Design a protein around this nucleic acid. Structure first.
Lengths: 50, 1273
RNA sequence: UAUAUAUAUAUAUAUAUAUAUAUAUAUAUAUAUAUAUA
RNA sequence: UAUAUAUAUAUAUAUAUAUAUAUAUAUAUAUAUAUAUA
C-alpha cells in the first residue's frame, strides 16, 4: 500500500528547498580581534583609545 | 471442571451429548427435559458458586438506592401520567423503585408475592388515585420484565451447560477450538457479585419470576428491598454474556459493556439512561474506522448495470486500497467523548479508541472487531406506559418556515381550492407532480375491470382489524341496523366481521360513518420508541383508495418505487454494498418523523387540490367503486358562480379532504394503565402498515428531486459543487422507502469531494427541509444504513444487538399462548443465529439445549385434568436443525445450511446410507422379501429403534388448537359466508365465471378420471378461508387443547415405518460429491463480518458461491404466469397445479376450467394456458411442483449458476446408464439437481460438485411413480 | 557428552508502533488584568 | 453586564524534540525442551 499510495499521488511535497533568502550581509569572512589590546591606567596613558 | 460435577446426572449426560462425546438419544433427551421442569430456578444461580472469577469488575452498592415510586406518578384530567423527575419531558419510562411494599404472599409459593387485592379493588371500584398509580406502576414494571421469549434463568442455564465442557474436535483442519474461556467473562462475574445481595441462607432468591400472566416478585425481609431495575440489569448481563460467547469477543470489550450497563443501572430510570446514550458504540466504531495513515487492504469491485432501474449489479473483481481512498468525513470521537463525560464513562471511550487503533488496515480482523463492539448495545425491548407514548409522540406539529399565503388559492370548489398558476417554489413542483399522476390515473380502463375491483375489495380484509365498536355506533346512530353473527364464533373487531356486516348496504348510505373514531395499538422496539398501529375501518380504507392509487403510480413510474415493490428484500443487499465501495460517496438521510410531519395545512391540502383537479379530465358522470357523481358548487368566479357535476373520484376527494382537515380522531384504551381510556384528535398520519409507505415514499422522492434540480443550484456557493451537483438525478442517484433514504454522489474523478463542500451541501439540505417543516436528520460517515442494514467498504455488518438472544416483544399484559408454540419460537430463534453469522459450532450447541427444554410441556383443565407430552428429538431435525453427531459418524459434519423438511432428511440419509445398511445386516435378521432401496438388511427397524419415524411424523402434527362449529351458528356461518361472498362478488360476471369453472372442473376431473377430491384453488373457497381465519383468531376452548394433546400422543405412539411417498422415492437416488467448485471471489476480501477462516463453514460457503445474487439467466422464477390474483389464494399453489397438469398432459379445457375457476375470462384463460410450457419454466419454478423449494437460509447466496451448471444429473463417465432420465429429463433433471445441491449444501466445508451416480430402480420407474403421485394429489 | 535442526524463555542491539513524563510551537476553552465599543 | 483586541496563568487537543515503559519484527548470545546423527 505504501508503494501504491506513493505512485498514485504526486502531491507528497518532498521538493528540493530552492527559495532561501538572506537580508543580512553577503559576506563569509569575519574580521576578528584575536589578541586584545591592554588597558593602561598608570603609565603610557593615552597611547590607546577605545 | 468442578462445575460439571455440580450438574445433576441427566444434565451431565446432556452436556456430554452437546459436547459431541456421545450420540444423542431420546432417553437422555427426556431425562434432561423432565428434570429442568421440576427443579427450582434458583439452583441455576447456585451453580455460579463454582467459578473462580478473575476479572476486574466491582458492583457498586449504588444500585440498591430505590427512588420512591409515589413521586413518579400522578393523575390529572383523570389520566395516570408519569411526571418525569428530571426537567426533560421525555423521562417517561419505568423509574428505579422498590416494588416491595405493594406485595402480598402467594399460597402456592409463600416466598414470592403479587399485587395486593385491596389495591386493585380500590383502583377499580373507588378509582382511588394512589391505588391507581400503584396499579399502573406495578403493571408496567411487570410488563417490562416480561419482554423475554422465556425466563432468563433458563437461558443462563443453557449457557452454563454448553460452556461446562469443551467440545470435541472434528477431523477438519479448520476446526479451531474456542479461544475464549470462562473465569474471564466480566458479565458472569458481575452477575455473581450482584446476586450476592439476594441470598439469605445460601438460597439465592431470584429478584423476579416471569409467568404467563406477567411476572411475580419476592417479598424482601425488613432489612432489604428489591429495586425493579436489578431484574432488568440481570437480563442485559445474561444476554450480553451469551452474545459475547457466541461472537467470541475479547474480555476487554465485554468489560466495557458491563461497566456500560452498571452505570446505566446505578442512576434512576434504567431504560431512559440507556436510551439517552444509545448510539455511542456504533459512533465510536462504525462511524470512524480508517481515519489514519496506514490504510490499505482489498475491497470489492462492484458495478451497477446500465438499466439502473432494474437494480442489477455485477461483481467484477477487487480494488487495492490506499490512502487516497481513506474516508473523508470527520471522525465521531469528539461528540461521543463529550457525551460520555456527562456519565463519567470516558474510560470506555479511551479503551475502545485504543483498541480500535490496532486495526489500521481493512481485513477480516477489522470488521470482526467492528461486529463485536457494535454487538455491545443493550438488546432490551424497552416499554413505557402507552398513555405517555401516545401523549408524547402525537403532541408534535411541524413548523413551516414559509407557509403558503391564503391569497395563493382560488375560490372553493365545495371543499378544495386549486393552486394559482402564479405560485412557484417546491409547492408548485409538488402540486404539478401529483396532478400529473392524477391525470394518468383518471383515464385508465385497468380499473372498472371487475377482477381488479375484486382485488381491491379483498385487499381490505384481514384476520386482524379494529375500530369495530366505532363502526357499529356510527351506523346505528344513522339508523342503519347491521346484521350480527356472534354465534359464529369470530371476533367482532376483526376487519372480516365488519366487512360482512357491510355487504348488503348501498355504499352512499355509509358516507356519514367515515368521520368516526379509530382505535390504536402499540408495538415495542429494541433500540427506539415503540411503533404505532392505527387500523382504519373498512369504509375509511375504501374511501382513501385514490390516494393510494396515485401514490402507487408515482412510485412504480418514477424511480420504480425505490425498491418498495419489496419482491425479495435481498435486492437492497448488493445496493448498499455498492454504495459503500471506496469509489462512491454515500450520504444517509431520513425524515425525522414523516408520519408526524405530513399534515393537511401544508401538504395534504396541496395533494387534495391537485388530485381533484387532476381528475377533471374524465367523464364527469362516472361512478367509481359504487360512489356516484354528484353536483357541487363552483365558486372560482366571483362574478359567475354556479354548480356542475363531478365524477365519483372527485367526490371521494371531497370527503377525503374533509376528513384530513378535520384530523384523525383516535381513542386510546391502554390496558397496562388503570381506568384511563379517552379520545383525542391529531394530524398524525395513521402509518400503521406498509399501506403508508407509498405516500411517504412518493412525497420523499418529489421533494428530493426538486431540491437537487432547482433549489440547490440556485442557492449553493461552491462552483465545484455546482459542477458536480448538476448532471445528477434521483432515478440514478437516490432511493428511499417511507422516511428512510439513500443519496449517493457521482464518482468524483479518482478523487473525493472536499468535506467543506459536503458541509455546505448538507447545511443547505437541512434548511431546505426546514422550509416546509421536515427535519432531515442527515449524516455523512461513509457507511450505508438502509432498512436497518449496515455495510462498510462493501462488507455487510450484521447488527446482532437488534436480535437479542433472550429478548422478545409482548404487547399485552398476558403472553396468551400455548406450550407447543415455543417450538416455533426456537426454530425462528435459531435461524437468526444463522442469518447473522455467529460461531456456527457453538451456536448449534446452544440451539439444541434450547430445543431440549422446549421439547416438553403440559396443560391443565380449568377445573379438571392435567395433560402432558413431549417430542422425540428427531422432530427438530425435520424442523431444520442439524444433528450434532449420529451413531457411527463424527460430530460436527453437518452445515447449518442444511435444508428443512424432506430435503434435509434425504440428504442426511444419503450420507448415512452405507453405514446403516451394513450395521443393520450385522445387528438384525434380514427382512422377508426384497426392498427397492434397501437390501435384505432391514434398516427400517433400526430407524424405528432410533425413533426416527416418531420424530418424522410428530413434526407433521399441528400445534394450535382448532375451534368447534355449531348448526345455528352455521346459519350465521352461512350468513357470514353469504355476506362475504356478496362482498366478494359485487357483480355477477365473476360469479358466473367461477361457477362455470367449478362445474366444468369437477366434471372433467371425474370423467377424465385424473382424480377426485383435488382441492384446487378457486374463488368459492376464499370466503371459507376467511371464515376459518376469523374463527382461528379467537382464544380456543379447553376441549380443543385436550384434543391436541391426545391426538399428538397417539401420533407419537402409533408404530409407523414409512416416510411420505416423495421421501421414499427420493431415497432411490445416490449422490456423490466431487472436488471443490472454482472460487467466486478472492478469499482475502471480507464480504460478511464474522464469515472468516475462524468461522470456517460460513467462510467456505460464502467464498465458494459469492453473496451477490446474480441470476443473469435464471431470474429465480419470479415470472409467475398469473401476475394479478386475489388475496387468500396462493400463487405458489396455482402454478404448481398448472405445471402438474401440463406434465400430466391434460387436455386444454382442463386448464381453461382451472383458470376460469379463479376469475380469468375465457379469452385470457386461453391466452394464459398457451403460455404454459416446460421450456420457459425455470429450474426452481418446475421443481416446486413436488414441494422442492429453496431454503430461506440460501436467499443470501448466488446459488443460481451452481444449480445450473455444477450439479451434474448425468455425467457420462460416472453415472450408471440405469439412471439415464432419457426424454423425461426435460422435467426430471431439475428435480435431481435440486436434490443434489441440497445434499451438497448439507455437509460442512467447501462447496463441491454434486453428481447423481445411481438410482437403484431405473430412472423410468422413478418417473412413472412420480407421475402417479402427481396424478394422485 | 558433542554437533545440527525446530520451538519456548531471558539478555543485548537495531527498527516500527502505542502509552506516560518534560521542553518548544500552534489552536481551543476558562480565569485575571488592560484598552475600546454598546 | 455584554462584545472585540492584547498580555499573563491554568486545562485540553495537535505537531516536533528528549527520556522512560510496553508490544511487534530482525540480528546476536545464553538457558530449557523435542527430534536426528556420532
Amino acid at each position: 500500500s505504501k508503494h501504491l499510495s506513493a505512485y498514485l499521488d504526486s502531491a507528497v511535497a518532498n521538493g528540493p528547498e530552492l527559495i532561501v533568502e538572506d537580508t543580512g550581509l553577503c559576506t563569509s569572512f569575519m574580521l576578528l580581534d584575536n589578541i586584545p589590546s591592554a588597558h593602561l591606567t598608570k603609565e603610557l596613558i593615552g597611547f590607546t583609545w577605545f | 471442571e468442578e462445575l460439571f460435577n455440580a450438574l445433576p446426572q441427566p444434565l451431565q449426560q446432556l452436556s456430554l451429548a452437546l459436547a459431541g462425546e456421545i450420540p444423542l438419544t431420546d432417553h437422555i433427551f427426556e431425562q434432561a427435559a423432565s428434570t429442568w421442569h421440576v427443579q427450582p430456578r434458583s439452583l441455576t444461580y447456585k451453580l455460579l458458586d463454582h467459578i473462580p472469577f478473575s476479572t476486574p469488575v466491582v458492583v457498586p452498592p449504588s444500585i440498591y438506592h430505590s427512588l420512591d415510586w409515589s413521586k413518579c406518578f400522578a393523575v390529572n384530567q383523570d389520566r395516570v401520567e408519569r411526571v418525569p423527575t428530571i426537567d426533560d419531558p421525555d423521562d417517561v419510562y419505568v423509574p428505579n423503585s422498590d416494588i416491595g411494599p405493594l406485595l402480598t404472599s402467594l399460597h402456592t409459593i409463600p416466598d414470592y408475592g403479587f399485587l395486593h387485592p385491596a389495591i386493585e379493588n380500590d383502583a377499580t371500584t373507588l378509582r382511588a388515585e394512589r391505588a391507581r398509580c400503584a396499579s399502573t406502576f406495578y403493571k408496567i414494571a411487570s410488563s417490562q420484565a416480561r419482554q423475554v421469549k422465556l425466563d432468563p434463568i433458563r437461558m443462563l442455564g443453557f449457557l452454563l451447560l454448553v460452556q461446562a465442557r469443551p467440545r470435541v474436535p472434528s477431523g477438519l483442519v479448520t476446526d479451531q477450538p474456542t479461544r475464549r474461556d470462562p473465569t474471564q467473562s466480566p458479565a458472569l462475574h458481575a452477575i455473581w457479585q450482584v446476586m450476592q445481595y439476594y441470598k439469605v441462607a445460601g438460597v439465592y432468591y431470584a429478584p423476579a419470576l416471569v409467568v404467563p400472566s406477567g411476572a411475580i416478585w419476592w417479598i424482601p425481609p425488613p432489612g432489604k428491598r428489591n429495586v425493579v431495575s436489578v431484574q432488568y440489569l440481570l437480563t442485559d448481563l445474561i444476554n450480553l454474556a451469551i452474545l459475547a460467547h457466541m461472537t467470541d469477543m475479547s474480555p476487554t470489550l465485554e468489560l466495557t459493556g458491563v461497566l456500560m450497563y452498571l452505570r446505566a443501572a446505578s442512576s434512576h430510570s434504567h431504560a431512559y439512561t440507556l436510551l439517552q446514550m444509545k448510539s455511542v458504540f456504533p459512533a465510536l466504531s462504525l462511524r470512524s474506522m480508517y481515519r489514519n495513515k496506514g490504510f490499505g487492504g482489498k475491497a470489492p469491485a462492484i458495478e451497477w448495470t446500465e438499466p439502473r432501474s432494474k437494480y442489477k449489479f455485477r461483481w467484477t473483481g477487487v480494488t487495492q486500497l490506499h490512502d487516497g481512498l481513506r474516508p473523508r468525513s470527520p471522525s465521531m470521537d469528539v461528540p461521543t467523548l463529550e457525551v460520555l463525560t456527562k456519565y463519567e464513562l470516558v474510560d470506555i471511550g479511551h479503551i475502545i479508541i485504543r483498541e480500535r487503533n490496532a486495526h489500521p488496515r481493512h481485513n477480516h480482523d477489522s470488521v470482526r472487531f467492528v461486529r463485536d463492539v457494535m454487538a455491545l448495545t443493550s438488546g432490551m425491548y424497552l416499554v413505557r406506559q402507552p398513555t405517555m407514548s401516545v401523549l408524547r409522540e402525537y403532541s408534535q406539529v411541524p413548523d413551516i418556515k414559509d407557509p403558503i399565503p391564503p391569497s395563493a388559492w382560488t375560490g372553493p370548489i365545495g371543499n378544495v381550492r386549486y393552486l394559482l398558476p402564479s405560485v412557484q417554489g417546491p409547492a408548485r413542483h409538488l402540486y404539478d407532480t401529483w396532478r400529473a399522476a392524477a391525470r394518468q390515473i383518471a383515464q385508465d380502463p385497468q380499473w372498472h375491470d371487475p377482477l381488479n375491483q375484486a382485488i381491491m375489495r379483498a385487499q381490505y380484509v384481514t384476520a386482524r382489524g379494529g375500530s369495530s365498536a366505532s363502526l357499529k355506533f356510527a351506523l346505528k346512530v344513522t339508523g342503519i341496523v347491521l346484521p350480527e353473527y356472534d354465534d359464529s364464533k369470530v371476533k367482532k373487531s376483526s376487519k372480516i366481521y365488519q366487512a360482512a356486516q357491510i355487504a348488503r348496504i348501498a355504499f352512499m348510505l355509509l358516507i356519514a360513518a367515515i368521520h368516526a373514531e379509530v382505535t390504536m395499538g402499540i408495538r415495542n422496539q429494541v433500540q427506539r420508541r415503540a411503533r404505532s398501529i392505527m387500523p382504519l375501518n373498512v369504509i375509511q380504507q375504501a374511501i382513501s383508495a385514490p390516494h393510494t392509487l396515485v401514490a402507487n403510480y408515482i412510485n412504480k413510474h418514477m424511480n420504480l418505487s425505490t425498491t418498495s415493490g419489496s419482491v425479495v428484500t435481498d435486492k437492497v443487499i448488493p445496493l448498499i454494498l455498492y454504495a459503500s465501495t471506496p469509489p462512491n460517496t454515500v450520504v444517509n438521510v431520513d425524515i425525522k418523523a414523516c408520519d408526524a410531519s405530513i399534515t393537511y395545512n401544508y401538504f395534504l391540502s396541496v395533494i387534495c387540490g391537485a388530485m381533484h383537479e387532476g381528475f377533471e379530465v374524465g367523464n364527469a358522470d362516472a361512478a367509481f367503486m359504487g360512489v356516484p357523481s354528484t353536483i357541487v358548487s363552483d365558486r372560482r368566479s366571483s362574478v359567475a358562480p354556479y354548480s356542475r357535476p363531478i365524477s365519483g373520484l372527485q367526490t371521494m376527494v371531497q370527503h377525503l379532504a374533509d376528513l384530513y382537515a378535520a384530523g384523525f380522531r383516535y381513542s386510546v384504551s391502554d390496558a397496562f394503565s388503570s381506568g384511563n381510556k379517552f379520545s383525542f384528535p391529531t394530524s398524525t398520519f395513521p402509518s400503521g402498515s406498509t399501506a403508508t409507505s407509498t405516500e411517504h415514499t412518493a412525497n420523499n422522492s418529489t421533494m428530493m428531486e426538486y431540491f437537487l434540480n432547482v433549489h440547490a443550484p440556485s442557492h449553493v456557493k461552491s462552483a465545484s459543487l455546482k459542477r458536480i451537483l448538476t448532471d445528477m438525478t434521483i432515478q440514478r442517484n437516490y432511493v428511499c422507502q417511507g422516511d428512510d433514504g439513500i443519496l449517493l454522489l457521482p464518482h468524483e474523478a479518482a478523487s473525493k469531494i472536499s468535506a467543506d463542500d459536503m458541509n455546505e451541501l448538507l447545511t443547505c439540505l437541512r434548511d431546505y427541509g426546514q422550509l416546509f417543516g421536515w427535519n432531515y436528520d442527515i449524516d455523512w460517515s461513509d457507511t450505508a444504513e438502509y432498512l436497518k442494514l449496515y455495510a462498510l467498504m462493501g462488507c455487510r455488518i450484521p447488527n446482532t444487538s437488534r436480535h437479542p438472544p433472550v429478548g422478545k416483544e409482548y404487547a399485552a399484559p398476558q403472553t396468551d399462548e400455548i406450550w407447543p408454540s415455543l417450538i416455533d419460537i426456537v426454530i425462528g430463534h435459531h435461524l437468526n443465529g444463522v442469518t447473522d453469522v455467529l460461531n456456527w459450532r457453538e451456536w448449534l450447541r446452544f440451539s439444541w439445549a434450547f430445543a431440549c427444554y422446549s421439547s416438553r410441556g403440559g396443560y391443565t383443565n380449568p377445573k379438571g385434568q392435567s395433560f402432558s407430552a413431549q417430542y422425540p428429538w428427531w422432530t427438530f431435525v425435520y424442523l431444520g436443525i442439524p444433528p450434532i453427531l449420529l451413531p457411527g459418524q463424527t460430530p460436527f459434519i453437518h452445515s447449518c445450511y442444511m435444508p428443512p423438511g424432506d430435503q434435509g432428511m434425504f440428504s442426511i440419509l444419503n450420507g448415512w446410507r452405507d453405514w446403516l445398511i451394513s450395521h443393520a445386516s450385522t445387528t438384525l435378521p434380514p427382512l422377508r422379501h426384497n426392498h427397492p432401496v434397501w437390501g435384505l438388511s432391514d434398516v427400517p427397524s433400526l430407524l424405528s429403534q432410533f425413533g426416527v419415524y416418531a420424530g418424522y411424523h410428530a413434526a407433521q402434527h399441528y400445534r394450535r388448537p382448532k375451534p368447534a362449529p355449531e348448526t345455528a351458528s352455521s346459519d350465521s356461518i352461512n350468513q357470514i359466508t353469504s355476506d362475504l361472498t356478496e362482498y366478494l362478488f359485487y357483480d355477477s360476471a365473476l360469479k358466473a365465471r367461477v361457477m362455470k369453472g367449478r362445474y366444468n372442473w369437477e366434471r372433467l376431473s371425474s370423467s377424465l378420471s385424473l382424480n377426485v377430491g383435488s382441492r384446487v384453488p378457486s374463488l368459492f373457497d376464499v370466503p371459507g378461508k376467511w371464515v376459518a381465519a376469523g374463527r382461528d383468531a379467537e382464544k380456543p376452548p379447553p376441549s380443543s387443547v385436550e384434543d391436541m394433546f391426545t391426538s399428538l400422543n397417539r401420533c407419537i405412539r402409533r408404530p409407523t415405518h414409512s416416510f411420505s411417498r416423495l421421501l421414499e422415492l427420493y431415497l432411490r437416488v445416490h449422490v456423490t460429491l466431487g472436488e471443490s467448485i472454482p472460487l467466486a471471489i478472492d478469499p482475502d476480501v471480507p464480504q460478511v463480518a464474522g464469515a472468516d477462516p475462524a468461522n470456517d463453514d460460513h467462510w467456505f460457503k460464502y467464498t465458494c458461491l459469492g453473496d451477490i445474487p446474480s441470476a443473469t439467466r435464471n431470474y429465480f422464477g419470479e415470472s409467475l404466469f398469473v401476475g394479478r390474483v386475489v388475496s387468500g389464494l396462493d400463487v405458489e399453489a396455482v402454478d404448481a397445479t398448472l405445471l402438474r397438469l401440463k406434465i400430466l398432459g391434460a387436455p386444454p379445457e382442463a386448464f381453461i376450467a382451472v383458470l376460469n375457476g379463479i376469475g380469468m375470462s375465457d379469452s385470457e384463460a386461453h391466452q394464459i394456458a398457451g403460455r404454459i410450457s416446460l421450456a420457459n419454466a425455470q429450474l426452481v419454478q418446475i421443481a416446486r411442483v413436488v414441494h422442492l423449494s429453496i431454503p430461506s437460509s440460501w436467499m443470501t447466496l448466488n446459488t443460481g449458476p451452481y444449480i445450473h451448471h455444477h450439479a451434474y444429473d448425468f455425467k457420462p463417465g460416472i453415472t450408471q446408464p440405469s439412471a439415464k432420465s432419457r426424454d423425461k429429463s426435460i422435467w426430471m433433471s431439475p428435480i435431481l439437481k435440486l436434490l443434489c445441491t441440497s445434499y451438497a449444501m448439507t455437509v460442512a466445508g467447501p462447496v463441491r460438485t454434486s453428481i447423481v451416480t445411481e438410482i437403484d430402480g431405473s430412472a423410468a420407474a422413478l418417473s412413472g411413480n412420480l407421475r402417479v403421485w402427481m396424478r394422485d394429489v
